[PDB]
């Protein structure tokens, strides 16, 4: 019956994100997406009464690393789009890890658990690109990057957030399964074409 299995099976939407991130030499992002996929897949499988026999760790661990992995995937995809060089890249990666870890651990269902990562990462991106536009005296990411990556990526991002945090009360089983697909598609689009620091 589809009602049970859809949130479990549709978590495999993140597997194309892992393979595409690996293929573009975004290995650290592919770890976070694969970690997320594993903990999101098992969070839904362990929650589902018809296949809860599959899970081995406590529900508390799977639920925490489902939410933490999801929020960290949103951070590392936006910091990949930002495309910082060293020593800022490792510093901004660690800033997300440490602040999202404490925030999610303090309260995993409270406000700021996803709008913290997105709100902060888009402010960091805006400040970098506004400096780069004043420097270049022209639209910094090419109209290609806006119309192919940033526009579609943030549209699938906005779709994922409004599916999960508005429409999900209509039917969880279908709307949460479309959230996995919309968010995985957002992570594919926001991630650049090549990891220029490693390829």
């Amino acid at each position, epitope marked *: 019956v589809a009602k049970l299995l859809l949130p479990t099976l549709s978590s495999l939407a993140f597997l194309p994100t892992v393979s595409i991130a690996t293929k573009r030499r975004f290995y650290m992002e592919a770890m976070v997406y694969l970690f997320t996929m594993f903990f999101v897949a098992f969070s839904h499988a362990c929650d589902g009464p018809g296949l809860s026999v599959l899970c081995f760790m406590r529900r508390d661990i799977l639920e925490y690393f489902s939410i933490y992995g999801t929020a960290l995937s949103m951070w590392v995809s936006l910091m990949a789009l930002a495309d910082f060089d060293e020593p800022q890249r490792s510093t901004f990666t660690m800033l997300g890890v440490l602040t999202i870890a404490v925030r999610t651990f303090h309260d995993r269902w409270g406000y700021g658990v996803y709008s913290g990562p997105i709100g902060t990462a888009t402010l960091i991106i805006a400040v970098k690109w506004l400096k780069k536009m004043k420097e*270049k*005296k*022209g*639209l910094y990411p*090419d*109209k*290609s990057i806006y119309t192919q990556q940033i526009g579609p990526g943030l549209c699938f991002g906005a779709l994922a957030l409004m599916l999960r945090f508005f429409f999900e009360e209509w039917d969880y089983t279908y709307v949460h399964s479309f959230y996995h697909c919309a968010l995985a598609m957002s992570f594919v689009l926001l991630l650049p074409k090549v990891n*220029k620091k490693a390829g």
Partner: antibody
Amino acid sequence: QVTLKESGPGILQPSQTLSLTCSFSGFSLSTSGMGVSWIRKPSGKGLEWLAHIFWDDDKRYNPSLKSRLTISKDTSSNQVFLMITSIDTADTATYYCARRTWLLHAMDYWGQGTSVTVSS
Amino acid sequence: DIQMTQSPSSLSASLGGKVTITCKASQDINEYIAWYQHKPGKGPRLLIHYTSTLQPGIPSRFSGSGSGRDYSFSISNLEPEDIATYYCLQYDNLLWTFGGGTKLEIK
């Protein structure tokens, strides 16, 4: 429609100074993100960039020539001026006036260029 | 300055054929390389911008590729109207530099 048209003296000698002018239409260069630039093709040689002037009256010059170029603007008549000082017979070229934009940062419209000669 | 060096200085070709020009930058120029077509007694035309983007109205036989110091430009289905001098432009910095130019010729 967009157009640029370069004009100048044609004949000079190395004691003298060069007063290049560039009339344009389709844009007025008071518009935000709009720019005009000067590029020159020396006699029997490839292109080299000289100078920029932007919408906000900001300016740039070639480090190799920075001392003896001054770029100016007049949007009252849609014109830009480049003044080149302390001339040498190395300045024998065609001088092009090219329009840059905000969305694509390279120049899109050029004029047909104007030739300058520097000999007795 | 950043040095832009086009590999063919001159390039002779058949009509209806295909050709490729390559250009090497002395630095990583972050895919900001425009390609221009110059004809005797005419102002140059912008054909391609960023690295691969054709200017609107330009025929789809012109194409360019590459990233990080190594960029390429190509004319397919080469017509006699494509016999011209082709320059690249590094435009990552507002210190603009052109490539040495490739004079295309009918063989």
